[PDB]
Amino acid sequence: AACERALQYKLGDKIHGFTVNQVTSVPELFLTAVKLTHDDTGARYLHLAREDTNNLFSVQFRTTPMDSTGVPHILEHTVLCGSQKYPCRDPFFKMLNRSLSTFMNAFTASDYTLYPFSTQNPKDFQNLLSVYLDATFFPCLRELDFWQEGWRLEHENPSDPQTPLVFKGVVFNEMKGAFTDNERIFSQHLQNRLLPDHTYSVVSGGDPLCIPELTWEQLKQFHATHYHPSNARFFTYGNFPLEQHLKQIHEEALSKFQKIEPSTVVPAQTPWDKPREFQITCGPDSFATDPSKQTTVSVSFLLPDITDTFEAFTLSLLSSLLTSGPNSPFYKALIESGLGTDFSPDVGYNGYTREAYFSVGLQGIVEKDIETVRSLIDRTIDEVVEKGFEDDRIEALLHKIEIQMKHQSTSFGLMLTSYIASCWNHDGDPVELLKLGNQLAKFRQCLQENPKFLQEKVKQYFKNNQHKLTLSMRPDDKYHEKQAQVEATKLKQKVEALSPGDRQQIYEKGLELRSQQSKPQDASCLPALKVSDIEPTIPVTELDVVLTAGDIPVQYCAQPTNGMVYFRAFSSLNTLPEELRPYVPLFCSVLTKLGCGLLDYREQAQQIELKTGGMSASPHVLPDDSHMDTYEQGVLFSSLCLDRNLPDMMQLWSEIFNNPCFEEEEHFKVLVKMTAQELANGIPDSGHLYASIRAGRTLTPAGDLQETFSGMDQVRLMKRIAEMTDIKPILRKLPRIKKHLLNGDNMRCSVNATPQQMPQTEKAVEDFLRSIGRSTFKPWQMKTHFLMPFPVNYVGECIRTVPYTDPDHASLKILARLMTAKFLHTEIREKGGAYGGGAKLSHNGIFTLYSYRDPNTIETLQSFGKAVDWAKSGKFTQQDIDEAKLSVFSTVDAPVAPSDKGMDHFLYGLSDEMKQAHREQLFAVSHDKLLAVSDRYLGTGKSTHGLAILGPENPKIAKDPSWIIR
């Protein structure tokens, strides 16, 4: 096994130029941690050897910007457009089709950047590790790649010099979209204000007004100073041997550098002595939203540095105690006070920065109450100092921590790297941060030996700490108007300062960039795989449906879930009246948080968090793979629990079915308002999803109903519901849904658990099931534009293909991945400047066309017209089809955690006879078939086309009478 061998490194062993410094076991996580340092370049290596296939490698570079120009983000964003060993254009989004990797993506945060990737096939791991090593340590920083990828000047047509020069770029629109997010605006301003001393004072992502002050030479110097491997943290996770990683790294990249000192350390923020206060302004509230109540307030403190692991542990626990749940002091003080609608952005602990900053505050309040809120918060802290915390809540919190320690996930390496990145960015020993068990034992001991421990901590960091702050934000109806005007003024200031020779230079450089883009060029220099590497057969999983008292089919699975238990239960909806369908999402939202039998919502929530590890309920619409318009709707009462707490949880579920409290009204108002706000916030960050859903509404009964359950109609409805003052008519609906959905008539349960816990689970599930009651489609074309005050655009469009078992559906899943990887990724992201775009084939058979953060709309609708023409013409080689197969078979074979194998058969009904049937219709894909399927479905007049676009108002779009404006 990986762990046993990995526990066999002796202190002081030289391994391919590395050195052994510390090895430790982590049994609560079942892994082994190894710390190594290179004898010359000083880069740190962390190896988390753990017996899981999906291995991960990540390289980290501390990027400490000193301005808002946005240099570290663009340096990260551009080194994915060539290098020395692979001078081909775009090595990254070409290796997205020459690898079996399930994750391959890169991140950049305030004071660091980090390139991880995780995969399962060792040869593919070696290939992509070489690609990253070369494409970060030795990139050819073409100025034209900076022009394409960062910011540049360009006419409305690089061929015509008679149209004005505007800014273009991908990072530019990326940040425009990122700061379309009011939460992000607030958090950015808060971090800048509370930490104004040093690098956190400036927008490391670059402000959409301060990007143009960045020049190519600055970028090259930032790279030459920051990406030297003395600023390199290497982190690898999984079962592949260590010698491979170290040998490849040392004898590929590290040998060509020498030791420097990375004078980049972020210094401590100076302590204030007087509480401060500020004011920021943001964009308006989406649609019909009362202008009065849109203010936001915070009171954010300053916690110690995260070099001391235990102090940060204790303060994280304390913040969770103070903020989370209807049993927390600030929930009772602030949330139920009737002023706000939710907590503030970044509420609770935030250890992202060098020093943690607790935050707390409302939003949706009226301005005149700000001092009120402040007083509340201040007063509330006082109360805690004189009371403390109820012991049962502490026990529930520790139980939840234990659950999150034990629950097995598919992507453990990614979570480990994204969890230790911040703490290890600042010379902090990361092994100590992995040992949750040791620190929980320490926490229990320290809490027991002194009863007032948490009271003293709250006093020390909330009473006697002067580094407070009180930020307050207000909506401006013309915030983005002002941003556009100042950007236009900056454009004019930058343009008139240019000689005609430089104008001709810009024009010729734009033409050369266009040539470098649209020229069909080579990619053979990169390593790759073959479809002879995709495994031919997948192992089968053991299922055993067991009818239990008396017609309830109850699947079971025996997985190594580490002593945890995963109950699930799908209950249908066919007998429900049609008029109560829209509120079914609301019913599921409030079902598990209103009162169960003899308990009230605070007691029930304390139970739920004491016994289980979460108890949700969320409607699904599952389509059928033997007919186009056959769908099974229904709610999925998922759950989770430790082994011992199994009957208790099950009793809870019975209580939730038999006796839900539909008369607690104040907490229902609170939950409705809070969740409606939470749905109103999210429309930007998932604009393409909403657009695609509204487009595909009219194609499929399943599509229309999924639009009702999660489309824009849902947020519209919830906004209408949280506005009302009389919530009686809505709370009088819930019994009518409980009497149709909380029974055992049309219900199929499921269980995942270790075999040793299988008979006890049999008994408990049967007890629960005995403890419950036992009582033409014509596709049609619609267009729709949603007026949304955003800078960037979100475009959707759908096509109606054939469902899963149809032979043609198999080939389309290669074409859809083919168009994205070759044609759409170029004519949308690299040319149109968007953040993302392409096509997918939904499991139901909807060929959807989407765009993510698109500066333009009509071109993309036309770029989609050129998408079918390019495919129908067959202008792709045979290896291109070999590329798509390698891609899809890295998506279809994405590893599944013990918690869900197999939930596809339980939900969608895919027996391993039908998966292998489809898996071989994909190996049987040839050039002639892609031509045969493309001209059949995607052609004009061959299907129905539903369109939907989210974005700012546009003259041409609003003109066409063939469009609907909403």
Spatial separation of the C-alpha atoms in residues 703 and 179, rounded to whole Å: 31
Spatial separation of the C-alpha atoms in residues 304 and 919, rounded to whole Å: 54
Spatial separation of the C-alpha atoms in residues 366 and 677, rounded to whole Å: 15
DSSP per residue, 139-158: ----HHHHHHHSEEEE-SST
Categorise residue 321: left if φ over 0, alpha if ψ from -120 to 50, beta otherwise.
alpha
Contacts with 899 (C-beta within 8 Å, 6 or more apart), sequence order: 407, 408, 409, 559, 561, 564, 566, 752
Find the farthest-apart pair of alpha carbons in the chain and give their distance in angstroms, rounded: 86
Nominal resolution (angstroms): 3.3
* Cβ(813)–Cβ(841) below 8 Å: yes
Write the secondary structure of 658-703 as one string of H (helix), E (strand) and C (coil): HCECCCCCHHHHHHHHHHHHHHHHCCHHHHHHHHHHHHHCCCCHHH
Alpha-carbon Rg of the chain, whole angstroms?
Answer: 29
Number of C-beta neighbours around residue 522 at 10 A: 9
C-alpha dihedral (172, 175, 181, 187), degrees to nearest 10 = -150
Token code pair at residue 924: 């049987």
Spatial separation of the C-alpha atoms in residues 211 and 219, rounded to whole Å: 12
Number of C-beta neighbours around residue 927 at 10 A: 13
927 is an annotated ligand-binding site residue: no
DSSP per residue, 506-575: HHHHHHHHHHHHHS----TTS----TTTS-S---------EE-SSS-EE--EE---TTEEEEEEEE--TT
Spatial separation of the C-alpha atoms in residues 559 and 565, rounded to whole Å: 10
DSSP 270: P
- Paired residues of 620 in beta bridges: 634
Buried b (16+ CB within 10 A) or exposed e, 6-32: beebeeeeebbbbebeebeebebbbbb
Q: What are residue 221's phi and psi, to 5 degrees?
A: -70, -40
Instruction: Judge residue 736's burial from the number of C-beta atoms within 10 Å of its C-beta, 0-12 exposed, 13-18 middle, 19 or more buried.
Output: middle
Spatial separation of the C-alpha atoms in residues 701 and 842, rounded to whole Å: 15
* Cβ(881)–Cβ(814) below 8 Å: yes
Spatial separation of the C-alpha atoms in residues 87 and 637, rounded to whole Å: 52
Select from 461, 64, 62 the least CA-distant residue to 271. Answer: 461
Spatial separation of the C-alpha atoms in residues 313 and 436, rounded to whole Å: 9
174 is an annotated ligand-binding site residue: yes
DSSP per residue, 569-600: EEE--TTS-GGGSTTHHHHHHHHTTS-BTT--
* Cβ(34)–Cβ(9) below 8 Å: yes
Q: Is 303 helix (H, G, I), strand (E, B) or coil?
A: coil
Spatial separation of the C-alpha atoms in residues 174 and 172, rounded to whole Å: 5
What does the chain come to in residues? 966
- Paired residues of 297 in beta bridges: 472
Spatial separation of the C-alpha atoms in residues 168 and 152, rounded to whole Å: 5
Alpha helices by DSSP H, 89-170? 92-95, 122-137, 143-149
Helix axis angle for 391-406 and 601-611, nearest 10°, is 40
Select from 687, 689, 706 the least CA-distant residue to 698. Answer: 706
Q: Is 17 helix (H, G, I), strand (E, B) or coil?
A: coil
Residues marked as catalytic: 76, 149
Q: Is 904 helix (H, G, I), strand (E, B) or coil?
A: helix
Whether residue 939 is preceded by a cis peptide bond, meaning omega within 30 degrees of 0, is no
Could you give the C-alpha distances from 671 to 369, 659, 729, 834, in angstroms and in order?
21, 20, 16, 36
Instruction: Specify the DSSP element, H or E, that contains 108.
Output: strand 107-109
Categorise residue 348: left if φ over 0, alpha if ψ from -120 to 50, beta otherwise.
left
Number of C-beta neighbours around residue 60 at 10 A: 24
Select from 521, 359, 383 the least CA-distant residue to 459. Answer: 383
Categorise residue 388: left if φ over 0, alpha if ψ from -120 to 50, beta otherwise.
left
DSSP 268: P
Spatial separation of the C-alpha atoms in residues 360 and 377, rounded to whole Å: 8
Domains and CATH numbers, the chain: 2-256 (3.30.830.10), 276-475 (3.30.830.10), 543-770 (3.30.830.10)
Token pair 């009226």 is found at 366
* Cβ(802)–Cβ(628) below 8 Å: yes
Contacts with 493 (C-beta within 8 Å, 6 or more apart), sequence order: none
Number of C-beta neighbours around residue 96 at 10 A: 20
Spatial separation of the C-alpha atoms in residues 811 and 96, rounded to whole Å: 19
Contacts with 196 (C-beta within 8 Å, 6 or more apart), sequence order: none
Spatial separation of the C-alpha atoms in residues 649 and 565, rounded to whole Å: 11
DSSP 634: E
73 is an annotated ligand-binding site residue: yes
Spatial separation of the C-alpha atoms in residues 840 and 850, rounded to whole Å: 9
Could you give the C-alpha distances from 15 to 2, 51, 554, in angstroms and in order?
18, 22, 52
Spatial separation of the C-alpha atoms in residues 175 and 289, rounded to whole Å: 26
Token code pair at residue 326: 């209807």
Select from 836, 762, 785, 847 the least CA-distant residue to 813. Answer: 847
Spatial separation of the C-alpha atoms in residues 315 and 75, rounded to whole Å: 35
Instruction: Specify the DSSP element, H or E, that contains 373.
Output: helix 370-387
* Cβ(439)–Cβ(447) below 8 Å: no
Instruction: Judge residue 659's burial from the number of C-beta atoms within 10 Å of its C-beta, 0-12 exposed, 13-18 middle, 19 or more buried.
Output: middle
Spatial separation of the C-alpha atoms in residues 428 and 317, rounded to whole Å: 20
Q: What are residue 561's phi and psi, to 5 degrees?
A: -80, 15
- Rounded to 5 degrees, what angle do the CA atoms 396, 397, 401 make? 115
Contacts with 17 (C-beta within 8 Å, 6 or more apart), sequence order: 38, 39, 40, 246, 250, 254, 255
Token code pair at residue 874: 């067959």
Contacts with 689 (C-beta within 8 Å, 6 or more apart), sequence order: none
Token pair 């990406």 is found at 227
Spatial separation of the C-alpha atoms in residues 781 and 777, rounded to whole Å: 13
Helices and strands of the chain, counted as H and E runs:
36, 28
Spatial separation of the C-alpha atoms in residues 464 and 462, rounded to whole Å: 6
Spatial separation of the C-alpha atoms in residues 343 and 331, rounded to whole Å: 9
* Cβ(621)–Cβ(709) below 8 Å: yes
Contacts with 614 (C-beta within 8 Å, 6 or more apart), sequence order: 608, 639, 640
Could you give the C-alpha distances from 305 to 145, 196, 228, 271, 428, in angstroms and in order?
39, 16, 26, 12, 10
